[PDB]
Design a protein around this ligand. Structure first.
Ligand SMILES: CCCCCCCCCCCCCCCCCC(=O)OC[C@H](COP(=O)([O-])OCC(O)COP(=O)([O-])OC[C@@H](COC(=O)CCCCCCCCCCCCCCCCC)OC(=O)CCCCCCCCCCCCCCCCC)OC(=O)CCCCCCCCCCCCCCCCC
Ligand SMILES: CCCCCCCCCCCCCCCCCC(=O)OC[C@H](COP(=O)([O-])OCC(O)COP(=O)([O-])OC[C@@H](COC(=O)CCCCCCCCCCCCCCCCC)OC(=O)CCCCCCCCCCCCCCCCC)OC(=O)CCCCCCCCCCCCCCCCC
Ligand SMILES: CCCCCCCCCCCCCCCCCC(=O)OC[C@H](COP(=O)([O-])OCC[N+](C)(C)C)OC(=O)CCCCCCCCCCCCCCCCC
Ligand SMILES: CCCCCCCCCCCCCCCCCC(=O)OC[C@H](COP(=O)([O-])OCC[N+](C)(C)C)OC(=O)CCCCCCCCCCCCCCCCC
Ligand SMILES: CCCCCCCCCCCCCCCCCC(=O)OC[C@H](COP(=O)([O-])OCC[N+](C)(C)C)OC(=O)CCCCCCCCCCCCCCCCC
Ligand SMILES: CCCCCCCCCCCCCCCCCC(=O)OC[C@H](COP(=O)([O-])OCC[N+](C)(C)C)OC(=O)CCCCCCCCCCCCCCCCC
Ligand SMILES: CCCCCCCC/C=C/CCCCCCCC(=O)OC[C@H](COP(=O)(O)OCCN)OC(=O)CCCCCCC/C=C/CCCCCCCC
Ligand SMILES: CCCCCCCC/C=C\CCCCCCCC(=O)OC[C@H](COP(=O)(O)OCCN)OC(=O)CCCCCCC/C=C\CCCCCCCC
Ligand SMILES: CCCCCCCC/C=C\CCCCCCCC(=O)OC[C@H](COP(=O)(O)OCCN)OC(=O)CCCCCCC/C=C\CCCCCCCC
Ligand SMILES: CCCCCCCCCCCCCCCCCC(=O)OC[C@H](COP(=O)(O)OCCN)OC(=O)CCCCCCCCCCCCCCCCC
Lengths: 114, 318, 115, 70, 83, 98, 174, 347
């Protein structure tokens, strides 16, 4: 029948979030609390439009919020965060149970600085 | 590097099997007021090596009436499955991490049954046939009871993953939780490994060496190695399942030492039982499981289904 | 992949052991050595004649109970459902029917070997 | 006496130490000194694939962080 | 009652395995209907977030739906926290 | 359709042609009957797993259960026939004629 | 690609050819066990680990009974093997030749049988891109036998109990 | 067999058939067939003898093969549609497999040999249950899936059934084999009308069941299993022979008896669809069935065969057990032709 429409490679371009899964899992609860609104908007768009091509701008905003959140962490609590996600990265299952001290230090740092 | 890991899993197991033969001979000797091997090497340490060399330099014969293809395949199947059973065991890290590590064990054991049947049938002798059919009955009874007991105990766990078993037993022991199932499991493992009082497939007193009567030299040694590897593997599985050692992710050698000590304790208990008790009759073995273990096993399965629900202690799925 | 490599390694090691066993030693074969074993005398019949099985009914019951346990195996995942009451009822129903089968056979003498 | 059984048990224990310790050492060697990643589910597998993609060396265990985002 | 006691004493002297089996099975059938923690188990199973909680489109007439995860509105797991 | 489905259907056809062509033993035909249900199990689970029909995953288990019931029934009939005639040969089931 | 599923399917067909050529119930059971293990492998590749291991375990248990029964009921002086008989070898060779012909035709061109149309391409091609998360869809669907499928449990349990009654009644004699 | 076990097995057979009839899922239909077969085997083997064992073995083999083919058809249909509901089948190959399996279950030619063999093997009560109920279930499935039935395959098997039933019945001299071949012919008639009017299929099913119940219960009452055994019944109870003769006339399709109604309605319905050669051939071939019914009627009622000397003691004694609904079956199988337009109620 018809020809499918695909976005060009120019408007699929965005600043990638090049942290690892351990880094993301360490700053996951704070990220979910801070960047909730763009992510909820993107998820509502994705579930209503049922089309990746119709929610690209919301994805751009999601990436922008993630980058802003990580820059804000990097400016204030880089050392406790590095210790925390270094502890998380050791575990094969990436367990929160084994890194409660480093998590406590990171939570104290982000509660005072931010 | 994975091939190096496979070799590091295989070769130490075979060495442990040889020295388990030595240890069993000496333990039985001291329980029978003898000494056991102490001449061949220092405290008889070279005895397994001497026996292995003798068996593999002796002549193997194929009986004139035997079916040669399944006469050869049976020891190959036995030893291959004996070596394969070790790959999902966490010590504390499995060589192969399976989502369903327990069903793999059950399936491979049920397959390893057929080595006895095919070696007995392919030998084409009456004593071999009698041993094979004794194996058939034994597998019937122990298989049904083993499956139900494993279902219950793993129902206390949450999944069929042995690393999850370690995490479950982080605080106390499954043997403290479920000691009746532990007793029935130990008896079923004896019946499964064909150990006394259930050594009926190869019963020297009734049958002249049972199913492997016609086997000589190397092919006999393969059956011996497979049986002893199965003994150690089943004791290791029992230790992981009921005697959970503490795990420290940064120093995993502590779990390995604890696991090895518990496995050795269970294996020496197997040898102790063999020294202590008479032999069953295989009809009485069938009547023991079905008429005694199976009712209690079903009742305990119902109890262990209901207990997490009635107390709000259902384990996590992952 | 890794499991296939492991199976290949185990099979190859066992086959090499068989090959060494059958090719290293000196062999001397004659009709008397390779004759079937029956305690020093010749076998009267053949080992391929029919061999009566006194537990033929327990074997069929084993087939049925084996598939009962196949039904019971997915219970650990069934405990994560929201319909806990329905799950518990059906699990106990299956176990009670298994117990009923065992009781019926036991009382009707299905567990007794043929004479 | 009964303590002459111990050297055989010692050898058997030493043999049973090798598999677990060897597996632990090889897991740490081929995963950058860390535990081998357990991927029992598609989510964990996708995390591993993303870690491989972002590393730039086609190895998931090479972990990148804030120094890489900026 | 006397017949029941005689039967039970005979069974306990002849088939203790069967007596124990029936006692365990009967307790397993009966106890869940009397336990107050069955509802707690159901609630714990319902509280596990296996999949993503897709948000709702706000019509301006949803006072019981939180606008943020940390808002007071929405289900609370404080009961499970101290359990 | 992939070639895997072709091979599974071919295996079913082979097992069906095996059942319909008796030789002497009733046991061999029973084994052919058990192969047909194995191929049915494999085909059903391949179709269901590919399509992510989640609630249909329990169907192959029920299929196996009734395969077991059929195998039990056939073995019972085989032991009765062997008791009557001394062998499981199908040539002895000739008392009744069309 | 690696054609692992295709190779396993071919071995599956080979085992079926064996036990359907019907040498003798011992080797019929051997071929059926091989086919069961290979089918376990096929469905493991396609995704169902529980289903594969379960069918393998069920057939391992079932063939154990068949061995004991063929020792007692279905044995003769010289059990037949594939090369022992002209009919058995003929049927085995016919099945192998048919499988080879169809495999070759499918690999060389998109083979449309007189029954169904088959395309020679990737079993990896036919797969789905999407993924689940933190649970197994197969495990959850099978576990739904108790929450959903109350009717199925009832009819299955009734059938099993009546099966025990039936096997006891058939073998009564008298 | 214990009476409790026997009645629970009968109830299990009926439950399997009812599950087949009430299910909307192909898996549940297959489960019903399996449950029916499993509980039906011991009923055949109720009176243990080598003939009963052989009949049960043949029945099991045939029904297991048919169930396997049926499940293959179900799975093939699921492959091409993803539908488990029993409706029009979406694949012609799956439909052909389903038709073959259901025909093998019903005994339509060329899948008919097991019918006379098993019926001769089993007792009169078991044969009654077999014919009646085991025809009752697969025909309901066929009626559900009728709109996708291949007319050529269905009508070919139907005409084959009519011809084979007539010829086999011509040769037979045993009462149970006569009943089996008559059953094959009647199944032929029903499945011939099936692709045009399932209502007429149901009407023929009901009339056939009534006539078969009356006939089998008369045989059970008279304790006759051969022609010569039935030739002694005029000297013990001449009423039973007369009722049997009227029932045989009804089964042969003679007006104004109740056996004429299904043939009449089916001929009319097929003629509405511009079928003439098929109804004419079907009507002419039924003369074979009428011939061997009349041959049976000559021996038992219209002529007096020699008797024996112990018939005097039999005269002195009286029949104890009372057949349930035998007078009602006799009347319904012979005198309900003026009530033909109730097939609309049947609709
Ligand atoms: C996943 C695995 C998949 C595998 C592929 C698929 C398999 C599907 C099922 C089987 C289908 C058919 C297989 C081929 C049949 C070939 C035809 C035939 O009759 O062969 C002769 C032979 C019968 O001869 P016999 O009566 O036993 O011996 C007496 C001689 O005829 C008397 O004559 P002789 O004494 O003069 O001849 C002596 C010679 C005769 O040697 C042979 O006949 C060798 C035949 C090798 C066939 C390999 C295939 O034997 C030797 O020299 C001894 C060494 C060779 C035999 C032992 C090793 C065999 C290979 C392993 O066939 C077999 O025994 C069939 C064996 C099939 C084994 C398959 C693999 C089994 C795996 C079991 C575990 C599975 C776990 C789950 C997965
Ligand atoms: C609790 C649950 C409910 C239970 C209700 C009471 C049933 C159990 C009573 C009992 O203990 O009976 C013992 C008795 C077994 O004692 P036995 O001494 O071993 O049997 C002696 C023989 O029956 C000796 O053979 P026989 O010559 O006495 O034959 C008996 C029977 C044997 O045949 C049958 O039972 C035939 C079953 C039905 C055949 C097909 C009928 C028509 C279907 C199509 C309808 C389309 C509309 O055949 C007849 O009575 C034929 C005429 C009755 C059927 C007329 C149907 C018209 C509609 O069990 C039965 O008679 C079974 C009845 C099961 C009924 C289930 C459905 C209600
Ligand atoms: C390079 C090797 C070439 C030779 C290979 C020979 C293979 C022979 C057996 C084929 C079937 C088994 C392998 C199938 C393909 C791989 C499947 C797979 O990916 O599994 C991953 C799965 C992973 O486990 P999982 O269940 O945890 O998977 C879910 C979790 N993820 C997805 C994250 C992995 O492995 C298993 O489940 C293990 C099952 C093994 C089943 C084996 C059955 C056949 C046994 C035959 C024994 C023969 C003994 C020797 C006889 C000799 C006689 C002379
Ligand atoms: C009717 C009687 C029922 C009895 C049920 C219990 C049977 C116990 C059988 C034990 C067999 C042990 C064989 C292997 C021996 C290994 C030895 C070893 O390494 O030990 C060091 C090991 C230490 O290594 P570990 O790390 O494995 O031990 C702790 C393991 N965690 C915490 C992970 C569960 O054990 C100990 O030192 C402590 C053992 C008990 C641990 C459980 C918690 C304490 C429970 C106290 C209450 C007990 C009440 C019952 C007591 C009386 C029972 C009759
Ligand atoms: C522990 C498990 C694995 C075991 C692996 C093997 C263990 C043993 C290793 C040492 C073996 C030493 C050689 C013994 C050979 C048999 C002796 C014999 O038959 O003598 C009578 C025969 C006598 O021959 P003859 O010609 O005098 O006799 C003619 C025949 N009669 C008797 C009738 C007169 O000896 C030989 O034929 C000698 C053959 C060469 C011997 C050396 C070759 C083998 C070298 C082995 C090195 C190790 C690697 C390769 C082996 C496999 C292991 C990887
Ligand atoms: C605390 C909670 C306690 C809860 C109640 C006790 C625990 C559960 C008891 C029932 C268990 C049923 C299955 C057990 C297997 C045996 C069986 O079925 O026996 C039936 C049998 C049935 O036999 P019988 O006694 O009915 O025999 C006939 C008797 N006449 C003739 C008088 C009618 O019971 C007995 O034999 C009774 C004696 C043993 C009962 C158990 C004694 C110990 C109970 C626990 C005491 C300590 C609890 C902890 C307290 C301290 C905590 C810190
Ligand atoms: C669930 C069973 C009912 C199913 C009925 C199906 C039709 C009948 C076919 C038989 C199947 C069931 C047969 C089981 C009883 C037959 C055996 C028997 O007669 O005796 C039972 C025997 C009695 O011993 P004696 O007869 O005295 O012999 C010893 C002599 N010294 O022991 C029993 O009573 C066991 C009976 C079954 C055990 C399980 C009891 C079930 C009770 C739980 C309630 C079940 C409700 C089901 C819903 C479950 C919801 C959670
Ligand atoms: C098949 C693979 C080739 C095996 C080597 C050649 C086969 C052979 O000659 O049989 C050797 C020997 C038996 O020989 P005999 O029949 O007793 O008489 C000759 C004594 N040397 O059999 C074997 O060793 C087979 C090798 C293991 C097979 C591995 C396949 C898996
Ligand atoms: C305290 C309160 C306890 C409540 C329960 C009290 C005990 C209940 C029944 C006790 C034992 C009754 C069984 C009959 C008996 O005493 O033994 C007779 C006889 C033993 O004779 P044998 O020599 O072994 O066999 C050959 C015979 N020539 O036993 C039997 O016949 C078997 C009858 C019972 C079958 C058991 C089958 C499985 C039942 C237990 C499964 C789990 C329980 C199920 C729970 C459902 C009910 C809640
Ligand atoms: C809803 C169920 C319908 C069928 C039930 C049949 C039950 C009886 C079966 C045995 C054969 C018929 C009876 C022959 C006499 C038996 C011995 C005797 O003396 O019986 C006395 C009995 C007295 O009647 P009684 O039992 O009191 O009535 C029911 C009370 N609740 O005498 C009688 O009962 C005699 C009269 C019986 C009823 C007439 C026969 C059936 C009528 C059906 C009407 C519809 C027509 C189509 C029928 C299709 C097939 C069912």
């Amino acid at each position: 029948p018809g020809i499918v429409e695909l976005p060009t490679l120019e408007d699929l371009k965005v600043q990638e979030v090049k942290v690892s899964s351990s880094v993301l899992k360490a700053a996951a609860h704070h990220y979910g609390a801070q960047c909730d609104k763009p992510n909820k908007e993107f998820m509502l768009c994705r579930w209503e439009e049922k089309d990746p091509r119709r929610c690209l701008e919301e994805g751009k905003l999601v990436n922008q919020c993630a980058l802003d959140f990580f820059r804000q962490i990097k400016r204030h609590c880089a050392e406790p965060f590095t210790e925390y996600w270094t502890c998380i990265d050791y575990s094969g299952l990436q367990l929160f149970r084994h890194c409660r001290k480093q998590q406590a230090k990171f939570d104290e740092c982000v509660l005072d600085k931010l | 590097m994975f091939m190096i890991n496979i070799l590091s899993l295989i070769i130490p197991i075979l060495l442990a099997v040889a020295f388990l033969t030595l240890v069993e001979r000496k333990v039985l000797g001291y329980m029978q007021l003898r000494k056991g091997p102490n001449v061949v090497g220092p405290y008889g340490l070279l005895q397994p090596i001497a026996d292995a060399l003798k068996l593999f330099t002796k002549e193997p014969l194929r009986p004139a009436t035997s079916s040669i293809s399944m006469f050869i395949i049976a020891p190959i199947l036995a030893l291959s499955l004996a070596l394969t059973m070790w790959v999902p065991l966490p010590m504390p890290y499995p060589l192969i991490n399976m989502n369903l590590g327990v069903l793999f064990m059950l399936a491979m054991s049920s397959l390893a049954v057929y080595s006895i049947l095919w070696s007995g049938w392919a030998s084409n002798s009456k004593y071999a046939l009698i041993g094979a059919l004794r194996a058939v009955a034994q597998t019937i009874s122990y298989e049904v009871t083993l499956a139900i007991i494993l279902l219950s105990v793993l129902l206390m766990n949450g999944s069929y993953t042995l690393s999850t078993l370690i995490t479950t037993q982080e605080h106390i022991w499954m043997i403290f939780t479920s000691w009746p199932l532990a007793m029935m499991w130990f008896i079923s493992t004896l019946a499964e490994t064909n150990r006394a009082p259930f050594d009926l497939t190869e019963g020297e007193s009734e049958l002249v060496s049972g199913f492997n009567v016609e086997y000589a030299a190397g092919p006999f040694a393969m059956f011996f190695m497979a049986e002893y590897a199965n003994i150690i593997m089943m004791n290791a599985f029992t230790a992981i399942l009921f005697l959970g050692a503490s795990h420290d992710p940064h120093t995993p050698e502590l779990y390995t030492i604890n696991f090895v000590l518990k496995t050795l304790a269970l294996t020496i208990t197997f040898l102790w039982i063999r020294a202590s008790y008479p032999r069953f009759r295989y009809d009485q073995l069938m009547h023991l499981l079905w008429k005694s273990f199976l009712p209690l096993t079903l009742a305990l399965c119902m109890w262990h289904i209901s207990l997490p629900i009635m107390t709000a202690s259902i384990p996590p799925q992952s | 992949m890794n499991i296939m490599l492991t199976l290949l390694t185990n099979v190859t090691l066992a086959s090499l052991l068989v090959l060494i066993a059958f090719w290293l030693p000196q062999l001397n074969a004659y009709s008397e050595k390779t004759s079937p074993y029956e305690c020093g005398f010749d076998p009267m019949g053949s080992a391929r004649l029919p061999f009566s099985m006194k537990f033929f009914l327990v074997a069929i019951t084993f087939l049925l109970f084996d598939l009962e346990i196949a039904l019971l195996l997915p219970l650990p995942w069934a405990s994560q459902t929201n319909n806990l009451k329905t799950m518990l009822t059906m699990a106990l129903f299956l176990l009670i029917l298994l117990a009923a089968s065992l009781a019926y056979e036991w009382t009707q003498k299905g567990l007794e070997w043929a004479e | 006496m009964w303590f002459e059984i111990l050297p055989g048990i010692a050898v058997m224990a030493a043999c049973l130490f090798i598999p677990g310790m060897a597996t632990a050492h090889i897991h740490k060697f081929t995963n950058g000194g860390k535990e081998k990643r357990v991927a029992h589910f598609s989510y964990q597998w996708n995390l591993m694939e993303r870690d491989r993609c972002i590393s730039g060396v086609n190895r998931y265990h090479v972990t990148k962080g804030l120094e890489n985002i900026d | 009652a006397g017949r029941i006691a005689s039967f039970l004493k005979n069974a306990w002297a002849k088939e203790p395995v069967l007596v124990a089996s029936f006692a365990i099975g009967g307790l397993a059938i009966i106890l869940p209907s009397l336990s107050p923690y069955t509802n707690y188990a159901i609630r714990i199973n319902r509280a596990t977030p296996y999949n993503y909680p897709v948000p709702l489109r706000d019509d301006g007439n949803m006072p019981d739906v939180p606008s943020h995860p940390q808002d007071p509105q929405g289900p609370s797991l404080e009961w499970l926290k101290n359990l | 359709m992939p070639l895997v489905y072709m091979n599974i259907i071919m295996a079913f056809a082979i097992a069906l042609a095996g059942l319909l062509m008796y030789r002497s033993h009733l046991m061999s035909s029973l084994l052919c009957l058990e192969g047909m249900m194995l191929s049915l199990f494999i085909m059903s689970t391949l179709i269901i797993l590919n399509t992510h029909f989640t609630l249909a995953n329990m169907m192959p288990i029920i299929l196996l259960v009734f395969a077991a019931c059929e195998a039990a029934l056939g073995l019972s009939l085989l032991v009765m026939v062997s008791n009557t005639y001394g062998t499981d040969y199908v040539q002895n089931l000739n008392l009744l004629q069309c | 690609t690696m054609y692992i599923a295709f190779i396993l399917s071919t071995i599956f067909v080979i085992g079926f050819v064996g036990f359907s050529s019907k040498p003798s119930p011992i080797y019929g059971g051997l071929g059926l066990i091989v086919s069961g293990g290979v089918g376990c492998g096929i469905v493991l590749n396609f995704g169902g680990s529980f289903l594969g291991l379960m069918v393998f375990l069920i057939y391992l248990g079932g063939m154990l009974v068949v061995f004991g029964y063929t020792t007692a009921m279905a044995t003769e002086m010289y059990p037949e093997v594939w090369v022992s008989n002209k009919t058995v070898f003929g049927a085995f060779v016919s099945g192998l030749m048919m499988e080879f012909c169809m495999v070759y035709y499918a690999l060389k061109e998109e083979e449309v049988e007189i029954i169904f149309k088959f395309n020679g391409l990737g079993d990896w091609v036919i797969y789905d891109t999407g993924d689940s998360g933190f649970f197994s869809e197969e495990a959850m669907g099978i576990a739904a036998l108790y929450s959903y499928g109350t009717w199925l449990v009832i009819v299955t349990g009734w059938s099993l109990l009546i099966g025990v009654v039936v096997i006891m009644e058939i073998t009564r004699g008298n | 067999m214990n009476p409790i076990i026997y009645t629970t097995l009968i109830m299990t057979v009926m439950s399997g058939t009812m599950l087949v009839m009430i299910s909307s899922h192909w898996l549940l239909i297959w489960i019903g067939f399996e449950m029916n077969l499993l509980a039906m085997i011991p009923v055949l083997m109720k009176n243990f003898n080598p003939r009963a064992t052989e009949a049960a073995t043949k029945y099991f083999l045939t029904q297991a093969t048919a169930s396997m083919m049926l499940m293959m058809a179900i799975i093939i249909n699921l492959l091409y549609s993803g539908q488990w509901t029993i409706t029009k089948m979406f694949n012609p190959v799956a439909m052909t497999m389903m038709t073959m399996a259901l025909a093998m279950k019903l005994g339509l030619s060329p899948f008919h040999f097991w019918v006379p063999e098993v019926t001769q093997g089993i007792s009169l009560q078991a044969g009654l249950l077999l014919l009646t109920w085991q025809k009752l279930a697969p025909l309901s499935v066929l009626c559900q899936i009728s709109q996708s039935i291949n007319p050529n395959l269905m009508l070919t098997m139907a005409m084959l059934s009519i011809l084979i039933g007539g010829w086999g019945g011509l040769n037979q001299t045993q009462l149970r084999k006569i009943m089996a071949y008559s059953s094959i012919a009647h199944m032929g008639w029903m499945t011939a009308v099936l692709p045009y009017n399932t209502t007429m299929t149901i009407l023929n099913l009901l009339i056939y069941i009534t006539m078969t119940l009356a006939m089998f219960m008369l045989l059970i009452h008279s304790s006759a299993t051969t022609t010569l055994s039935l030739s002694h019944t005029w000297n013990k109870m001449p009423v039973i022979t007369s009722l049997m003769m009227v029932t045989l006339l009804s089964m042969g399709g003679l007006p104004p008896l109740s056996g004429f109604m299904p043939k009449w309605m089916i001929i009319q319905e097929m003629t509405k669809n511009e079928s003439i050669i098929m109804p004419t051939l079907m009507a002419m071939t039924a003369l074979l069935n009428l011939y061997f019914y009349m041959r049976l009627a000559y021996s038992s009622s219209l002529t007096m065969f020699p008797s024996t000397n112990n018939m005097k003691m039999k005269w002195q004694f009286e029949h104890t057990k009372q057949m349930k609904l035998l007078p009602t079956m006799i009347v319904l199988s012979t005198l309900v032709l003026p009530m033909t337009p109730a097939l609309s109620s049947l609709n």
